[PDB]
Amino acid sequence: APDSITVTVADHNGVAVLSIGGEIDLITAAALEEAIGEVVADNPTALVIDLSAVEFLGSVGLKILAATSEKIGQSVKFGVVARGSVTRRPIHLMGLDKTFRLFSTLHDALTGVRG
């Protein structure tokens, strides 16, 4: 992946947690898509994408999150951690908070993505 994005993969009792940091733009978009693809290929029962550390969420990133929800939402419990001006705000401004479940913290997403 480019140096301007960071992607880590973790597990919380079977919930896959994909944590993104740095900037999500046209330069780093492929790396983000590839990381999501890999996680989804392992058939998680639930997936939380944590955007807590994201410093810039470009429109391409909004597209990726919406597409992911549409692609997997029927088969995988899906959630996104986003708060503040960079991530949560444009997701709401575009109305995409209705398209996937947003959580303010990882704790909420983990306790909420299952039940």
Binding site: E23, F56, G58, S59, S85, P90
Partner: protein, 129 residues
């Protein structure tokens, strides 16, 4: 028209320059005391217009970006010599982004025939804090 605090940024119209532009635009908004939501909106709005221009820009066109923080509004103008008049327009996800972030999204071009020597396309928007 420009206010005393207007900043003109000129870079080669290449995707590799978008990260720098976002950093400078954010520094301007922060210096102008925009709040966190307004700085993020400005960065995203400008990133979107600059992305659209670059993807149509001639190979060594210059991207010219003007950030003009006013009294009540921040006016943004970006332009570049492009290979089409269809750089961005209503109905696209890009246009939806710009109008969700800004108040008066407008475009313009110079009417020259793009496949000859390109056509300057411009986007202007007003981001009110």
């Amino acid at each position: 028209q420009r206010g005393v605090r207007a900043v003109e940024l000129n870079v080669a119209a290449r995707l590799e320059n978008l990260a720098l532009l976002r950093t400078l635009v954010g520094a301007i908004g922060t210096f102008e005391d925009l709040d966190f939501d307004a700085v993020a909106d400005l960065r995203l709005a400008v990133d979107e217009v600059c992305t659209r221009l670059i993807r149509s820009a001639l190979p060594d066109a210059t991207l010219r970006l003007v950030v003009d923080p006013r009294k009540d509004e921040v006016v943004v103008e970006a332009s570049a010599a492009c290979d089409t008049h269809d750089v961005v327009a209503p109905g696209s996800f890009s246009w939806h982004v710009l109008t969700a972030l800004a108040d008066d999204v407008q475009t313009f071009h110079d009417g020259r025939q793009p496949d000859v020597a390109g056509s300057v396309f411009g986007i202007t928007l007003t981001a009110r804090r």
